[PDB]
Design an enzyme around this catalytic site. Structure first.
Site, PDB file in Angstrom:
ATOM      1  N   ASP C   7      26.846 -12.172  31.171  1.00 27.08           N
ATOM      2  CA  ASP C   7      26.732 -12.302  32.613  1.00 27.08           C
ATOM      3  C   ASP C   7      27.854 -13.247  33.053  1.00 27.08           C
ATOM      4  OD1 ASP C   7      25.831 -12.823  35.335  1.00 27.08           O
ATOM      5  OD2 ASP C   7      24.024 -13.370  34.892  1.00 27.08           O
ATOM      6  N   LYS C  68      36.767 -15.083  39.181  1.00 27.90           N
ATOM      7  CA  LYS C  68      36.452 -13.751  39.652  1.00 27.90           C
ATOM      8  C   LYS C  68      36.937 -13.435  41.024  1.00 27.90           C
ATOM      9  CE  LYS C  68      32.377 -12.015  38.931  1.00 27.90           C
ATOM     10  NZ  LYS C  68      30.912 -11.995  38.848  1.00 27.90           N
ATOM     11  N   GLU C 172      26.015  -5.722  37.851  1.00 27.23           N
ATOM     12  CA  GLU C 172      25.038  -6.810  37.900  1.00 27.23           C
ATOM     13  C   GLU C 172      23.621  -6.294  38.249  1.00 27.23           C
ATOM     14  OE1 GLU C 172      25.850 -10.009  40.804  1.00 27.23           O
ATOM     15  OE2 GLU C 172      24.591 -11.202  40.179  1.00 27.23           O
ATOM     16  N   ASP C 196      20.445 -10.401  44.959  1.00 24.15           N
ATOM     17  CA  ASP C 196      21.405 -11.165  44.147  1.00 24.15           C
ATOM     18  C   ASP C 196      21.893 -12.425  44.883  1.00 24.15           C
ATOM     19  OD1 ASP C 196      23.595 -11.585  42.047  1.00 24.15           O
ATOM     20  OD2 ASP C 196      24.795 -10.416  42.761  1.00 24.15           O
TER      21      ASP C 196
END
Ligand SMILES: Nc1ncnc2c1ncn2[C@@H]1O[C@H](COP(=O)(O)OP(=O)(O)O)[C@@H](O)[C@H]1O
Lengths: 259, 132, 511, 147
Positions: C7, C68, C172, C196
């Site tokens: 993750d 990211k 995800e 999320d």
């Protein structure tokens, strides 16, 4: 409520039989057309030419790859080739039924000498007779004939080319190779294969001289009301689209042999 | 001075099969050579992530195709990592014996030539159409 | 030693390994399963994880994190421009591939974000390896569902730099759905809503699952909403308080603010299980000891809009998916920030009191799913199915008593199990309202000589002449031999069942 | 990039249109397209096109098995993708790119594989969803229905 059972004791297993069942009977023959007149073929030839070009469209579509051509070009080719396909179709029937002396408009209609030489007939029909005479002089087989009819289908195109021309060109060249094969396996020897091939090919090329004159008759009678000539919707559309290009040299004659 | 080497038997046999077996799908020729150039291009690209100097000799990573009909030739240019003298000799950089043996077994079992790249010996397919 | 899944987040990351039907989530050097997506470049070495996070205040100019946002993007990309204005480190247009310039061992090298994330992945690799007692290259790395293809390739490459065999890049929300078992089959034709709420971002994704097959229907989100701004509201509470209480302007000291923020993070995590949490920092600013507090209610007030706004993308996702509230069957939480009671209350109330799937720590659920997926991808066996079929068989034929006192088998002896087999029966006699099915085990033609396993009644059968009602009797046997015999009348849809427990010459003459 | 690997929301109808014409050698445009992706246990992407026309050969001469191209991890496998869709749907032209199919392709491997079973199951339900979308806005549904 009751205990269940495997009833009715009538549950079939026809599975192996269902695997067996496959065949059905298929049939040939899909449509038909004739003219309804003789010296008056001067107007009925157009009604016939209409039905024959339509049949030529169905026939052309039946040839693998024809339906993958752009429709605008599929129609352009029948618009320009219908005249050679008609004269050539008459040619075969004339060759076999009257020793190429008379034109055979349909299996059931032959126009004899007393009508054949009249100007309303003959000014156009003498060019169609040329074609009949050559298939007879040449002693063309039916296979060779069909190869040639098939070649004529794609023989007249715009000088500017076709939208999907590359496929048309592959199809047309396949057809000329087929004419060669039809001849090689029939005449025997080597010199006779090339003579029969080139002589038959010369007819395909001279079909354009036949078309120039046959079309000029149709173009003239289409536009000049003095002639009193009726056309079907199919040819009427073809002729109005064909006149401004053919008579002005905007249509290319494709030859399969040199002089 | 030109050094002459033997091919290892598994590939000497593979090349014979490529040339003499009547495979019709000759188009895999170009497919495999382009694909192999891609692998070489990635080999540099990955190294350049931790060692950028690998691109100092030329920043452009690409594949070029250049036919020259008059010489009956086609040039495929891989600007990827390339090979040293030693790798050219050592089966153009691959594990020729294990890959090719497994492939020949696959061919004996009915595999198509299009599967040659799946064994890591795809470049021997060049001989499908190449004389040299 | 099974394949792992990682993750890879903007603020945090987590690694798990799938084995023995479960994912083991693996702790780092300090015992933390989830560790920061931080690399600190110092003049002696690069610290990774908690080690880098712990010194952000001291070396923020050389600490790179949240790779990211830059990964897979062009330098001129508005997102890149948006984030570089927020970083302590320099972002460089090196061929329109933004690199980060920090001092490592005295050199101001420009590090590309893929290598920054590979550094993080390498650390996660090492954590899982130490735990498993084995080197691990087979891996799945998750990405946000919205990542484009340059971003997905960039993630794969970070894995390759780290020495991983990237089996796959998965989304995800897919991973979370996997972690919660919504892909175990038998739960098909269901809509799953994944909320999320992470560190620096918030995303909503609606998935449809059909017996293990996934489709994503809609996504929505807020690229800047997450735990970091809940921390910033808690920071403003404490920063302004400090200044007013002491008449000392702490907001201008990046280190004092960061120490205060670290306490805000700790207090906030504590506060989520508590009703109250405190801040206790010695010599926080200009030698001042700052002792104060936050209550849960105050926290919620400070962040009341940050919490309410999370439902705006929920409504957006529902609109995009063309779904009403009633069409969501499964409510799923992802991200540590969803551990705050207010978030749970808002999502649960929005969906009319329906329970949220909180069975896996929200920060572990994604890694969890990635690990499960990694294990199937490394070789397609995951506590199933061929061994169950070849080892366990029906030891005796299984069938039912039918009229005549005879046994009709539906499952043949030594047939592999699990399996489902059926046959068509009718009522024996004319015009009956139902049937009596007696389930037996054994090889005798007569039921009197077999093992009665149990009995049931199938009701709801229209009376009709014998042989007319169409009853399908099903023998549904699982891997352990447990047998469920059911029956239904196809003309009415009515059905019933019984559960069966486990045992475990002339031609040579003349005339 | 391959059109089917691109994002369906960004791809315009003009892009799908020209792609289709090239894919099918059809100068006419597509009637409708369903562009979708699948993940989880089986990853693939696909484009299924309903042509504006049903030009006769579909019921007699066309080698319909070549209507849908198959790719695996973007590797072209074949045009004759027999059994991707049941016969009644063989008028749909398109591309299916399955990330999880093996490249060791033979008809026997594909036929006995659960992957093909699943791809067919899902391509079909998606086709039906497209038809349903076409059923709405009946003015265009009938254009479809007529052919
Ligand atoms: N109990 C809690 N209460 C409030 N916030 C929490 C709690 N536990 C973890 N968090 C926050 O959750 C975040 C972890 O985010 P995660 O989803 O793992 O990463 P990412 O957003 O990078 O994908 C951190 O910002 C952390 O402070």
């Amino acid at each position: 409520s009751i205990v269940p059972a495997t009833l009715p004791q009538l549950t079939p297993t026809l599975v192996s039989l269902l695997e067996v069942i496959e065949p059905e009977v298929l049939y040939a023959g899909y449509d038909s057309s004739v003219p309804d007149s003789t010296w008056r073929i001067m107007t009925t030839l157009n009604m016939l030419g209409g039905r024959q070009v339509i049949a030529a469209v169905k026939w052309a579509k039946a040839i693998p790859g024809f339906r993958n051509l752009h429709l605008d070009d599929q129609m352009t080719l029948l618009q320009y080739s219908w005249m050679s396909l008609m004269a050539f179709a008459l040619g075969w029937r004339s060759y076999r039924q009257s020793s190429a002396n008379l034109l055979c408009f349909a299996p059931d209609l032959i126009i004899n000498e007393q009508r054949m030489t009249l100007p309303c007939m003959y000014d156009q029909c003498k060019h169609m007779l040329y074609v009949s005479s050559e298939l007879h002089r040449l002693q063309v087989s039916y296979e060779e004939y069909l190869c040639m009819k098939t070649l004529l289908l794609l023989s007249s195109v715009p000088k500017d080319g076709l939208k999907s021309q590359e496929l048309f060109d592959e199809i047309r060249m396949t057809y000329i190779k087929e004419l060669g094969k039809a001849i090689v396996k029939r005449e025997g020897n080597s010199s006779q294969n090339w003579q029969r091939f080139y002589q038959l090919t010369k007819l395909l090329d001279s079909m354009h001289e036949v078309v120039e004159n046959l079309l000029n008759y149709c173009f003239q009678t289409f536009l000049d009301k003095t002639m009193s000539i009726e056309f079907p919707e199919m040819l009427a559309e073809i002729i109005t689209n064909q006149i401004p290009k053919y008579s002005n040299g905007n249509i290319k004659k494709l030859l399969f042999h040199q002089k | 001075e030109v050094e002459t080497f033997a091919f290892q038997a598994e590939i000497a046999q593979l090349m014979s099969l490529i040339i003499n077996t009547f495979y019709s799908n000759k188009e895999i020729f170009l497919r495999e050579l382009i694909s192999n150039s891609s692998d070489a291009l990635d080999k540099i690209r990955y190294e350049s992530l931790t060692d950028p100097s690998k691109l100092d000799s030329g920043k452009e990573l690409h594949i070029n195709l250049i036919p020259n009909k008059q010489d009956r030739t086609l040039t495929i240019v891989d600007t990827g990592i390339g090979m040293t003298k030693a790798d050219l000799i050592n089966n153009l950089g691959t594990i020729a014996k294990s890959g090719t043996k497994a492939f020949m077994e696959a061919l004996q079992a009915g595999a198509d030539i299009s599967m040659i790249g799946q064994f890591g010996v795809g470049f021997y397919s060049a001989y499908l159409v190449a004389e040299k | 030693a099974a394949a792992i899944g990682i993750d890879l987040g903007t603020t945090y990351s987590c690694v798990g390994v799938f084995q023995h039907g479960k994912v083991e989530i693996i702790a780092n050097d300090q015992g933390n399963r989830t560790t920061p997506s931080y690399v600190a470049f110092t003049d002696t070495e690069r610290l990774i994880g908690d080690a880098a996070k712990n010194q952000v205040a001291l070396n923020p100019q050389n600490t790179v994190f949240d790779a990211k946002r830059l990964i897979g993007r062009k330098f001129g990309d508005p997102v890149v421009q948006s984030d570089m204005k927020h970083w302590p480190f320099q972002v460089i247009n090196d061929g329109d591939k933004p690199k980060v310039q920090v001092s490592y061992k005295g050199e101001t090298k420009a590090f590309y974000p893929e290598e920054i994330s590979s550094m993080v992945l390498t650390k996660m690799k090492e954590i899982a390896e130490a735990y498993l007692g084995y080197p691990v290259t087979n891996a799945v790395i998750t990405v946000p569902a919205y990542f484009n293809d340059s971003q997905r390739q960039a993630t794969k490459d970070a894995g390759v730099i780290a020495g991983l065999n990237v089996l796959r890049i998965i989304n995800e929300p897919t991973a979370a759905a996997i972690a919660y078992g919504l892909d175990r089959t038998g739960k098909g034709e269901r809509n799953v809503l994944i909320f999320d709420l992470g560190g620096g971002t918030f995303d909503v994704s609606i998935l449809t699952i059909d017996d293990g097959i996934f489709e994503v229907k809609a996504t929505a989100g807020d690229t800047h909403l997450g735990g970091e701004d809940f921390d910033n509201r808690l920071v403003n509470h404490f920063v302004e308080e400090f200044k007013r209480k002491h008449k000392k302007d702490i907001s201008q000291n990046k280190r004092a603010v960061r120490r205060l923020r670290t306490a805000c993070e700790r207090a906030k995590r504590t506060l989520s299980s508590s009703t109250q949490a405190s801040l206790e920092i010695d010599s926080l600013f200009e030698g001042i000891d700052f002792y104060t507090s936050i209550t849960r209610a105050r926290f919620e007030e400070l962040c009341s809009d940050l919490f309410r706004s999370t439902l705006e993308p929920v409504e957006k996702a529902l609109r995009d998916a063309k779904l009403d509230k009633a069409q969501i069957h499964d409510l799923v939480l992802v991200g540590g920030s969803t551990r705050i009671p207010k978030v749970q209350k808002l999502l649960q109330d929005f969906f009319n009191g329906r329970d949220l799937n909180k069975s896996i720590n929200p920060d572990e659920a994604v890694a969890y799913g990635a690990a499960v997926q990694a294990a199937i991808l490394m070789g397609d066996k995951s506590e199933n199915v061929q061994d169950l079929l070849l080892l366990d068989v029906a030891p005796l034929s299984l069938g039912l008593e039918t009229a005549g006192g005879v046994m009709t088998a539906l499952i043949k002896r030594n047939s592999t199990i699990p399996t489902k087999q059926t046959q068509i029966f009718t009522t024996y006699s004319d015009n009956q309202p139902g049937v009596l099915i007696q389930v037996y085990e054994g090889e005798r033609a007569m039921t009197k000589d077999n093992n009665l396993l149990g009995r049931f009644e199938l009701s709801g059968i229209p009376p009709a002449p014998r042989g007319v009602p169409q009853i399908e009797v099903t023998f549904d046997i699982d891997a352990n031999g447990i047998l469920n015999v059911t029956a239904t009348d196809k003309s009415t849809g009515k059905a019933n069942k019984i559960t069966i427990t486990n045992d475990k010459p002339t031609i040579e003459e003349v005339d | 990039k391959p059109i089917w690997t691109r994002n369906p929301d960004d791809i315009t109808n003009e892009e799908y249109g020209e792609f289709y014409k090239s894919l099918t050698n059809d100068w006419e445009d597509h009637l409708a397209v369903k562009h979708f992706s699948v993940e989880g246990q089986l990853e693939f992407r696909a484009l299924l096109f309903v042509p504006r026309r049903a030009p006769f050969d579909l019921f007699e001469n066309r080698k319909k098995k070549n209507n849908i191209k198959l790719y695996v991890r973007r590797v072209f496998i074949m045009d004759n993708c027999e059994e991707l869709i049941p016969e009644y749907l063989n008028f749909i032209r398109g591309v299916v790119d399955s990330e999880d199919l093996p490249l060791n392709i033979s008809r026997e491997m594909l036929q006995q594989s659960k992957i093909l079973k699943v791809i067919r199951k899902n391509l079909v339900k998606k086709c039906l969803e497209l038809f349903t979308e076409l059923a709405e806005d009946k003015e265009n549904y009938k254009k479809f229905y007529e052919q």
